[PDB]
Structures are given as structure tokens and as C-alpha cells.
Design an enzyme around this catalytic site. Structure first.
Site, PDB file in Angstrom:
ATOM      1  N   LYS A  50      41.923  27.575  32.569  1.00  0.00           N
ATOM      2  CA  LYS A  50      43.314  27.153  32.417  1.00  0.00           C
ATOM      3  C   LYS A  50      43.475  25.634  32.268  1.00  0.00           C
ATOM      4  CE  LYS A  50      45.200  31.389  32.449  1.00  0.00           C
ATOM      5  NZ  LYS A  50      45.500  32.135  31.206  1.00  0.00           N
ATOM      6  N   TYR A 104      38.454  30.664  36.828  1.00  0.00           N
ATOM      7  CA  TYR A 104      39.798  30.876  36.316  1.00  0.00           C
ATOM      8  C   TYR A 104      40.567  29.536  36.139  1.00  0.00           C
ATOM      9  CZ  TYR A 104      44.592  32.714  35.823  1.00  0.00           C
ATOM     10  OH  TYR A 104      45.889  33.014  35.415  1.00  0.00           O
ATOM     11  N   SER A 107      48.674  28.567  33.498  1.00  0.00           N
ATOM     12  CA  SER A 107      48.798  28.858  34.912  1.00  0.00           C
ATOM     13  C   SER A 107      49.128  27.596  35.721  1.00  0.00           C
ATOM     14  CB  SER A 107      47.531  29.450  35.441  1.00  0.00           C
ATOM     15  OG  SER A 107      47.669  29.890  36.730  1.00  0.00           O
TER      16      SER A 107
HETATM   17  N1  LIG Z   1      50.304  37.123  37.069  1.00  0.00           N
HETATM   18  C1  LIG Z   1      49.833  36.005  37.628  1.00  0.00           C
HETATM   19  O1  LIG Z   1      49.590  35.842  38.842  1.00  0.00           O
HETATM   20  C2  LIG Z   1      49.550  34.846  36.670  1.00  0.00           C
HETATM   21  C3  LIG Z   1      49.622  33.521  37.159  1.00  0.00           C
HETATM   22  C4  LIG Z   1      49.383  32.353  36.436  1.00  0.00           C
HETATM   23  C5  LIG Z   1      49.053  32.573  35.106  1.00  0.00           C
HETATM   24  N2  LIG Z   1      48.952  33.901  34.533  1.00  0.00           N
HETATM   25  C6  LIG Z   1      48.606  34.124  33.120  1.00  0.00           C
HETATM   26  O2  LIG Z   1      49.600  34.906  32.457  1.00  0.00           O
HETATM   27  C7  LIG Z   1      49.007  35.668  31.368  1.00  0.00           C
HETATM   28  C8  LIG Z   1      49.408  37.138  31.577  1.00  0.00           C
HETATM   29  O3  LIG Z   1      48.815  37.776  32.731  1.00  0.00           O
HETATM   30  P1  LIG Z   1      49.499  39.043  33.483  1.00  0.00           P
HETATM   31  O4  LIG Z   1      49.811  38.763  34.912  1.00  0.00           O
HETATM   32  O5  LIG Z   1      50.625  39.559  32.664  1.00  0.00           O
HETATM   33  O6  LIG Z   1      48.178  39.985  33.458  1.00  0.00           O
HETATM   34  P2  LIG Z   1      48.038  41.604  33.367  1.00  0.00           P
HETATM   35  O7  LIG Z   1      49.281  42.165  33.934  1.00  0.00           O
HETATM   36  O8  LIG Z   1      46.682  41.747  33.903  1.00  0.00           O
HETATM   37  O9  LIG Z   1      48.052  41.713  31.753  1.00  0.00           O
HETATM   38  C9  LIG Z   1      46.992  41.052  30.998  1.00  0.00           C
HETATM   39  C10 LIG Z   1      47.073  41.748  29.644  1.00  0.00           C
HETATM   40  O10 LIG Z   1      46.129  41.085  28.763  1.00  0.00           O
HETATM   41  C11 LIG Z   1      45.217  42.042  28.246  1.00  0.00           C
HETATM   42  N3  LIG Z   1      43.810  41.593  28.029  1.00  0.00           N
HETATM   43  C12 LIG Z   1      42.964  41.066  28.913  1.00  0.00           C
HETATM   44  N4  LIG Z   1      41.794  40.851  28.376  1.00  0.00           N
HETATM   45  C13 LIG Z   1      41.903  41.231  27.097  1.00  0.00           C
HETATM   46  C14 LIG Z   1      40.894  41.221  26.074  1.00  0.00           C
HETATM   47  N5  LIG Z   1      39.664  40.761  26.263  1.00  0.00           N
HETATM   48  N6  LIG Z   1      41.275  41.694  24.853  1.00  0.00           N
HETATM   49  C15 LIG Z   1      42.536  42.202  24.620  1.00  0.00           C
HETATM   50  N7  LIG Z   1      43.472  42.246  25.619  1.00  0.00           N
HETATM   51  C16 LIG Z   1      43.166  41.748  26.861  1.00  0.00           C
HETATM   52  C17 LIG Z   1      45.152  43.160  29.335  1.00  0.00           C
HETATM   53  O11 LIG Z   1      44.674  44.426  28.849  1.00  0.00           O
HETATM   54  P3  LIG Z   1      43.880  45.419  29.834  1.00  0.00           P
HETATM   55  O12 LIG Z   1      44.770  45.470  31.050  1.00  0.00           O
HETATM   56  O13 LIG Z   1      43.797  46.626  28.992  1.00  0.00           O
HETATM   57  O14 LIG Z   1      42.579  44.772  30.173  1.00  0.00           O
HETATM   58  C18 LIG Z   1      46.612  43.209  29.780  1.00  0.00           C
HETATM   59  O15 LIG Z   1      47.392  44.075  28.934  1.00  0.00           O
HETATM   60  C19 LIG Z   1      47.522  35.245  31.406  1.00  0.00           C
HETATM   61  O16 LIG Z   1      47.253  34.284  30.394  1.00  0.00           O
HETATM   62  C20 LIG Z   1      47.321  34.955  32.896  1.00  0.00           C
HETATM   63  O17 LIG Z   1      46.184  34.159  33.220  1.00  0.00           O
HETATM   64  C21 LIG Z   1      49.211  35.044  35.333  1.00  0.00           C
END
Ligand SMILES: NC(=O)c1ccc[n+]([C@@H]2O[C@H](COP(=O)([O-])OP(=O)(O)OC[C@H]3O[C@@H](n4cnc5c(N)ncnc54)[C@H](OP(=O)(O)O)[C@@H]3O)[C@@H](O)[C@H]2O)c1
Ligand SMILES: NC(=O)c1ccc[n+]([C@@H]2O[C@H](COP(=O)([O-])OP(=O)(O)OC[C@H]3O[C@@H](n4cnc5c(N)ncnc54)[C@H](OP(=O)(O)O)[C@@H]3O)[C@@H](O)[C@H]2O)c1
Ligand SMILES: NC(=O)c1ccc[n+]([C@@H]2O[C@H](COP(=O)([O-])OP(=O)(O)OC[C@H]3O[C@@H](n4cnc5c(N)ncnc54)[C@H](OP(=O)(O)O)[C@@H]3O)[C@@H](O)[C@H]2O)c1
Ligand SMILES: NC(=O)c1ccc[n+]([C@@H]2O[C@H](COP(=O)([O-])OP(=O)(O)OC[C@H]3O[C@@H](n4cnc5c(N)ncnc54)[C@H](OP(=O)(O)O)[C@@H]3O)[C@@H](O)[C@H]2O)c1
EC number: 1.1.1.10
Lengths: 244, 244, 244, 244
Positions: free
Chosen positions: C153, C149, C136
Site C-alpha cells: 500500500k 500488506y 489503505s
Molecule cells: N476492508 C478493509 O479493512 C480495508 C482497509 C484498508 C484498505 N482496503 C482495501 O480496499 C480494497 C477492497 O477490499 P475489501 O475489503 O472490499 O476486500 P474483500 O471484501 O476481500 O474483496 C476483495 C475483492 O477483490 C478480489 N480479488 C482479490 N484478489 C484477486 C485476484 N488476484 N484476482 C481477481 N480478483 C481478486 C476478491 O475476490 P475473491 O474474494 O474471489 O478472492 C474480492 O472480490 C483493497 O484494495 C483493500 O486492500 C480494505
């Protein structure tokens, strides 16, 4: 906490105004012997009245040849504060050869030359010492119209690191301080607009700009044996601006 | 340079040994009132004999529920040094769930809990304060077998930053100090091999490991109002290791 | 530019939604064999309909014992994308033991466990591979209510570094990608307020949040042999947020 | 992964040798139109034989006035690789005014001037574009006898950031690549001693120096729309040297 600065000989560049001036004032107050180096005679005249006994040297530090001649027989210098700098602000697409050259001659080349003169002296005498380079918050964060100034300060941070590497065996520590806006002639040239400063203020966790005293305290700590295992660092004096 | 630490109430964690012990010793010598928190009773017994009038609190900071109960009616605390930590070293492919859990519980979650307790008190009283987190040269450079330890310290640096951001409006500064090897029980567990320590020593411009006094000096500066525009920072006490 | 990802076996965590879903989609389109791991069965059912031939594994990665059991006979995995994470947002003074524990269990300890399983397999086979950790913009800049969070990270960045150091001799590269807000369920939970997002947007030189495709592109580059001397890095996908 | 570089007009500085030469070769191979700028005519003569159709421009980029005249009617340029640099190595205490001036004129001032010419063109045409600045591992880590060279590269990293800030609204991305030793004329001048290179090699997790192809791949990715949310970055191509 006694810093053991009393009686030691300290050279301060850009001593005429702002941070350099405050540094000379603090050092003179604690009983250090000070060499005060700056561009404008009137600034040094008034300083010597305020701080009797300091050795004024009026020279343009962007002039390598004139610097060498002026800092020639400066004498033993134990401690060095490189503070002289210019902020020549231009939009990137308007940067000029002349503003680039001037900025690097003053903000970086002079740091090399003055530090060489001081370091050579320390080594010839076989005595440890310390150098502080006044950098900026802008050394690691870009600001509109500061391409040249930010690049000098980023360069200065790295310079500080190489100096630390090579002078560490000679027991000479070399550190940088990195202040936010300090309301001085430089600071309140362009941050004098209450909403240009407003956006930056909102990014500072402590919700304020730096006072000269904040910077001077950091410089003194880095000059002292109290910071005896700190070298090659960039000590922020920017109220948490880098953190968020 | 007077730090204005006389009379203020300071809580120090991991006070039993090494850096935390030295911090208690220094603060007691300058006239601060100290709450010394550490895991082992014998360490605290001896320290109270050395430093009469300090308030010992023996607790395992890895235990959230027990920490809450022990640091319950601690009273007004103006200043906080989060120093307790464990270095559980395992090759990456040997890292265990247990070692990870323990490391994060002590090295980070306890930093949160103890900092909340002190910060909540400061805000209730409406007075400024300061927090110093003892991190590591490892917060920003990887060392073999230190995957967990490095991660706790990398986390702790960023924790220091969020705490600085959120506590700044309450005039509470939050900073980290980042020492190299300090020959203490932790330091001379694994760096006791004269050639394991040799490769690191060759990477330190000042050519030596840090003494406890070096770290205590940096802590005391960051606790005092002398560092009044420094927050969210990571002050290296690593002889230049990061620089090269 | 051919990435040579066709035919290789790739495991992606958090595959159910957002970035991890997009990563599965892209990899399947280029001819990689994918093991899609995620918490919610319905997400995996639909993805296998969209991407026939992917191998779904439904597991809660916060559960060490259950992860070990589920990723047991996963088989040869050449490439690994650690993307699963939780964003549990609480003001610092409201941070709970439960939120801390959950966050570190999923965001970091699972990165260790899944990476060990894949890395051990690579070493047994004596073949090179690559790991990408999704970090992140918050790994290096603090955001209000994101103390936990941000810390996960920041830890994950340093974890990426130790893993790079220890796995490099086994020809396994380990890199992180560091996106800004991505409008996904996580991104548009709290950045859905047009003025909460407004202050951040003003800090992004490219004047927009990241699309899933931006992040997937960076992941795929860091998985491929095209990035063959890049390891231990933190590749920003934040429109310049870190730069200013 | 199609980078969509075919048919676009790319200017490459320091095209005569090493990384710049490899970059021209890769771009010519993928169907880009190339303007190849370098100091020595013979290097450009042979390059044009190898890569028929490239437009050679022989000029000393340390000469502002001569640069302006030579890059005058260059024509539409969509993409820019600033690769020309000099490594003038001197111990800190032996740094000369002439070596400082030359290094900053070539390594930084020319980056400003060439990027201005290209950026002005893009903006006049209302079209997005991309700039890659070839920095170094040394931009963030000090090396003995590299005070000047390290300072140019530290400056270049910051310059990259300010450029990114100011040109982001014009849809122009600006990134840096930061290679370790690449065995070219520069690399194998001073790292040609098998034990001077030995100490550095031991610090590289991937246990090797960079090939020209590694650097070129990173440049191409950063030039392409594949890295569409990456700007103001410093992409390491140093085998994990920064990580440990
Ligand atoms: N989008 C942002 O604003 C943002 C910004 C900076 C960094 N990131 C990073 O990017 C990555 C992707 O996030 P995203 O935005 O794509 O999030 P999302 O749309 O919330 O998707 C997260 C995915 O990971 C799965 N997950 C979470 N906990 C899990 C667990 N304990 N076991 C198995 N699966 C799990 C979730 O499943 P469920 O939904 O079924 O729980 C979901 O399918 C992360 O590492 C996040 O911190 C995101
Ligand atoms: N306030 C801010 O916005 C700010 C923020 C971050 C960092 N800094 C840094 O803090 C340091 C001090 O700045 P300040 O705000 O105190 O500035 P100031 O009030 O402008 O003082 C700078 C002093 O340096 C002297 N100087 C400049 N060029 C010189 C030259 N060529 N030769 C000899 N002396 C010269 C100036 O002399 P003349 O006035 O006679 O030219 C003046 O006495 C610098 O290194 C600056 O880059 C300032
Ligand atoms: N020394 C180094 O090489 C080095 C280098 C970089 C950073 N650091 C950091 O510097 C700090 C001080 O370490 P040090 O070298 O002084 O270590 P030390 O000599 O091992 O002292 C650590 C102290 O913290 C206490 N402690 C540990 N876990 C605790 C817990 N769960 N609850 C209550 N007290 C606990 C220990 O008590 P017991 O002994 O009774 O367990 C001990 O008194 C740490 O934050 C460490 O990571 C040290
Ligand atoms: N290999 C390493 O040790 C290393 C490591 C990290 C980063 N880098 C960086 O990688 C980039 C490429 O270096 P390299 O190893 O490919 O070097 P190289 O083999 O020396 O190539 C540099 C090229 O730049 C040209 N050049 C230099 N000064 C010039 C000037 N004033 N005007 C016009 N052209 C000029 C050189 O021309 P002449 O030969 O005709 O002067 C040469 O063709 C640089 O930005 C360098 O700083 C190199």
C-alpha cells in the site's frame, strides 16, 4: 565521529531549563563558545556557574522590540538552536486570543527574529552555518488540548522548509528536531498522569519517552558538517510514534 | 562524538560499489568488524585488499534460496545496512513483468530476508541492535521512468515503519536514509546528462548532489546509540529537495 | 452535484465482494457501463443478476499472462478502479517468500498491468480519463503483522504518484483512496475481535469504521470531472485516524 | 450525486473575491442559505445583487474583538468555509513583525475564532456539521518569499487535524483544501510573470493552474455527507504538484 563543533560560537534560546539547558551543557563540554538566552535570570545564573564562560542573555523572546535590543551586539554567531517555546494548553473551544498570541510570539515569531539576526551575521561574514529548530512530535500529530501548540509546531516545520530554501544559497542549513514527551517541566506538567502518558507510551515502539540526551545528540548532529546534505528536514526523536 | 561502533559486527549489502562500498570503508576505518555482501566477486576481492579482515560473501540477493544458504552461518551480527538495490528504469507504459519482479526481489524482499536473519539472531542473543535501510529521495517524490524504482522505495519506507513497530519491543531500531542523486554508477547512468541533472539541481536548495560521505555519515549516526530514540524514520540526504 | 458518469465505460477489479462490489453497484445505478473483473465466478454470476448488463471477466489478476489474455479485447474503457487486493498477514519474522510474492503480484503489479491496458487505450483514442487505486490507511501507518500488506500500500501510494506524473500530459488523472477498516471479509477477518478493533477505534476521531458507501463516494468523486485538478493524491477515508 | 446542501445555512469568510466568492455563488445556486463575510463593503454589495438573499457581514477578521461583535447574532450555522487569508510576501531576511502578526491574525487566528462561534452553535443545537479550511499547496512545499504565508498554511493544516480530533465526538468534520495557484487577485499578483509561473507550471503534471470551480467543487464535496468518513485531511487541488 568528530562533529567539529569545538571553538564555534553557538546561540541557544530557552537555555534555562530542559532541552535548551542540556544543549548548552553538551556544547560547553565539547569546547564550543555558547550564548545562552532564556526568560528567567535564576536559570541563567546557575547555568553560568555550571558552565563557566557561557554568555547569559536574559530576555523575553516573545517581545520583538526587547529581543532586537538584547541580541543587538551579540557578536559573531556561527550556529543557532531555537529551543524556547511555551505550551499553553486549552481545549479547542476554549482557546483564547491571549494564549494564541503568546504561543505564536514565542514559538514562531522569535524563531524568525533570532534566526534573522544570526543569518544576517553569517552572510555579512561570508561564512556557512547551521540552524536547528526544536519542534515536536505534535507538529505532525494532533493531541487533545494542544490546538495552539500543535499549530505553532506545524508552522515551525514549514518555516524550517522555507528558511532552508532561501538560506541554502548562503550555505546555511536549517533543520528541525521533533521529540516526543521529554520529562522536563513542560513534559511532566500534563503527561505526569501515569495513564494519560500510558495511552501515548503504548503508541511508542521503543516503549519509552525521550531523554534530554537523545534530543541534544540529534541537535548536535544537525548542527555539524556531518549532516552536510540535510536541510529542510524534520528529524523525529519520538521512539517511532510517527511510524504507527 | 564517539558513536561506539568500534568492535561491533556489521553486515552491509551491496558492498561492492558506491554507497555500500563507502559504508564498508568508513566502518572498517572506525574499527567495526564487517561482513561485506555483494553480487560481483571482483568488487569484493578489491575491497578485502583495501580493507583487510572484512568477511566477503558473494551472492545474488534477488535469489531467496541462495541468500538463505549464503547468509546461513554468518554469525553474530549486531548492525545491518540494507543498501543493495537495482534501478531498472522504464516509462510507465513500458514497464515489464520482469523489471517489476527483479526490482521488488532485490530492493524489498531481500531487505525482509536479510533483516529477518540478523533480527532473529539479535533476539536469540537477547541484545539490542540497529538496521538502516537505504532508500531514496524517490521514495516520496515521483520521477519520470522511475515508476518501479519509486514504488520499491515507497514500499521500503513503509517496510522500515512496520519493522520499527514490531522490532522496537526487542530494542532493535530500524531507520531509512533517503539520498538524492549520488554520482555513482547508478546516479551517473541517467543523471549524467548535464541538463537532465540541471532541472533537479535547480530544485535542491544546497545546489548540489550528495557525495557518498554524506550518506555514510547519516547511516553511521542511525546505526549508533546516538540516535537512540529515532526509529521508523526517513532521514533525507537530498540537499532540501523534499522541502520545496 | 452531477458527476457526469452516466454512459461512460468503467472497469472495476476485485468486483466480486466488498468495496469493488459496492462500486459496481453504485456505478450501474448511475447509468455507467461496467466491466466487472474478479477472481471467483460465483461472485460475478450473482452480481450480473443484481446488475444486468455489466460485463463479467473472471480472472486471477496475480497471473500477468492470464490477465493480458483476459483483458485483451476488453474494448474502450474510460475509467478504472483498481480495487483487487489480498491481505496476507504474518508477523515480520514470519514473513514468507510466497506471501510476499502473491501480495505484490495482486496488490501492485496487477495495478500496473490493468492501468497500462486502460491507459494505452485512452491514449490511442486521444481522450481523457481517470484511475482510482484503492489503497489503505496502512499505506502510511504501520500495523502489527501487516509488514507485507503495509508495504504494498505504501508502494501503491508512490505508484499512484509516478502514474499521475507520466499520465498527466495525456489528461489521465490517477488518485488513491485510503480507507480505514471496512467491515467486509478482509476487514472482519482480523478486526473481528472487539478489543483488537477497540484500540484502533479509540484512535479514530469519528469513533467508527468506514462503510462501503463511504469509500464508493470518494471513488466516484475522484473518477468524475468534479475532481479535475486532483491527481497523485491519497484521499483518506479513515475517520481521522491519520490526523492524530 | 446529490450533496444534500440545499436549505442548510453556510457561512463563508473572504466571500468578496476569488474562491470565497465562487463558493458563495455555487452554494446560492444549489439552494443553500449563505452568510457572506468579507473585508470590503463594495464586494459584498455586488455579491448580494448577484445572489439575492445572502446575508452580508462586512468585517475585518484580523480584529478578534470586532469579529466577536459582528458574528455575534449570526444565527444557526450548519456549515463553515474558512477562506479569508492574506499573502504578505517578503524574503525571509526581510520579514517584519507587522507582516507576521497580520498574516497569523487573518490566516489562522480568525479560523480559530469563526470556527469556535460555528462549533459552539452546532454543539448547543446537538446537530452534526462540517468545516472546510482553505489552505494551500504552500502548506507542505516552500516557495521563495512565502516564509510567513507558508508557515500560516502549515499551521492551518495542523489546526485542521486538532479540530478534527476534538470535534469528531460532536459529529463535526473538519477538512482542508490545498489549491495550487488560482488566477485571482492573490494568484496573479506574483505569478503574473509568465516565467515565474513557468517554473511552477512545469512541476504540475496536469500542466495548468487551478480554476475557482475546481476549488469550489472540492469544498462542496468536503462539506457534504458524501465525505462522511473524511476528517483531518488536506485535499490537494494542485494538479499533482505534491506528487513529483
Ligand atoms: N476492508 C478493509 O479493512 C480495508 C482497509 C484498508 C484498505 N482496503 C482495501 O480496499 C480494497 C477492497 O477490499 P475489501 O475489503 O472490499 O476486500 P474483500 O471484501 O476481500 O474483496 C476483495 C475483492 O477483490 C478480489 N480479488 C482479490 N484478489 C484477486 C485476484 N488476484 N484476482 C481477481 N480478483 C481478486 C476478491 O475476490 P475473491 O474474494 O474471489 O478472492 C474480492 O472480490 C483493497 O484494495 C483493500 O486492500 C480494505
Ligand atoms: N517535553 C515535552 O513535552 C516536549 C515535547 C516535544 C517537543 N518539545 C519542545 O522542546 C523544546 C524545549 O522544551 P522543554 O521540555 O525543554 O521545556 P522547559 O523545560 O519548559 O524549557 C523551555 C525553556 O525555554 C524558555 N523560554 C520559554 N519561553 C521563553 C521566552 N518567551 N523567552 C525566553 N525564554 C523562554 C523557558 O524559560 P522559563 O522556564 O524561564 O519560562 C525554559 O528555560 C521546545 O521547543 C518545546 O516546544 C517539548
Ligand atoms: N546513487 C543514486 O542516485 C541513489 C539515489 C537515491 C537512492 N539510492 C540508493 O542507494 C543505495 C546504493 O546505491 P549506489 O548508488 O551506491 O549504487 P551502485 O553504485 O550501483 O552500487 C549498488 C551496489 O549494490 C549491489 N547489488 C545490486 N544488486 C545486488 C544483488 N541482487 N545482490 C547483491 N548485491 C547487489 C551492486 O553490485 P553489482 O554492481 O555487482 O550489481 C553494487 O555493488 C541503493 O539502495 C540505491 O537505490 C541511490
Ligand atoms: N490564488 C492563489 O495563489 C492561492 C493558492 C493556494 C491557496 N490560496 C488560498 O485560497 C483562499 C482564497 O484566496 P483567493 O485567491 O480567492 O484570494 P482573493 O481573490 O484575494 O480573495 C481573498 C478574499 O478574502 C478576503 N479577506 C482577506 N483578508 C480578510 C480580512 N482580514 N477580513 C475579511 N476578509 C478578508 C479578501 O478581502 P479584500 O480583498 O477585501 O481584502 C477577499 O475577498 C485563501 O485561503 C488563500 O490563502 C490562494
Amino acid at each position: 565521529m568528530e562533529l567539529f563543533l569545538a571553538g564555534r560560537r553557538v546561540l541557544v534560546t530557552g537555555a534555562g531549563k530542559g532541552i535548551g539547558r542540556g544543549t548548552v551543557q553538551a556544547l560547553h563540554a565539547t569546547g564550543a563558545r555558547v550564548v545562552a538566552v532564556s526568560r528567567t535570570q535564576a536559570d541563567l545564573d546557575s547555568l553560568v556557574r555550571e558552565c563557566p564562560g557561557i554568555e547569559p542573555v536574559c530576555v523575553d523572546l516573545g517581545d520583538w522590540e526587547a529581543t532586537e535590543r538584547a541580541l543587538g551586539s551579540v557578536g559573531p554567531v556561527d550556529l543557532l538552536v531555537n529551543n524556547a517555546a511555551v505550551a499553553l494548553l486549552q481545549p479547542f473551544l476554549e482557546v483564547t486570543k491571549e494564549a494564541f498570541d503568546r504561543s505564536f510570539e514565542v514559538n514562531l515569531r522569535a524563531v524568525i527574529q533570532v534566526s534573522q539576526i544570526v543569518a544576517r551575521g553569517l552572510i555579512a561574514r561570508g561564512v556557512p552555518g547551521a540552524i536547528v529548530n526544536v519542534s515536536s512530535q505534535c507538529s505532525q500529530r494532533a493531541v487533545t488540548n494542544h490546538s495552539v501548540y500543535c499549530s505553532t509546531k506545524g508552522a515551525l516545520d514549514m518555516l524550517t522548509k522555507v528558511m532552508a530554501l532561501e538560506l541554502g544559497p548562503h550555505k546555511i542549513r536549517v533543520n528541525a528536531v521533533n521529540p516526543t514527551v521529554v520529562m522536563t517541566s513542560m513534559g511532566q506538567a500534563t503527561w505526569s498522569d501515569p495513564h494519560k502518558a500510558k495511552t501515548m507510551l503504548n503508541r511508542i515502539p521503543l516503549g519509552k519517552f525521550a531523554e534530554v540526551e537523545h534530543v541534544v545528540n540529534a541537535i548536535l548532529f544537525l548542527l555539524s558538517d556531518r549532516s552536510g546534505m540535510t536541510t529542510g528536514s524534520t528529524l523525529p526523536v519520538e521512539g517511532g510514534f510517527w511510524a504507527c
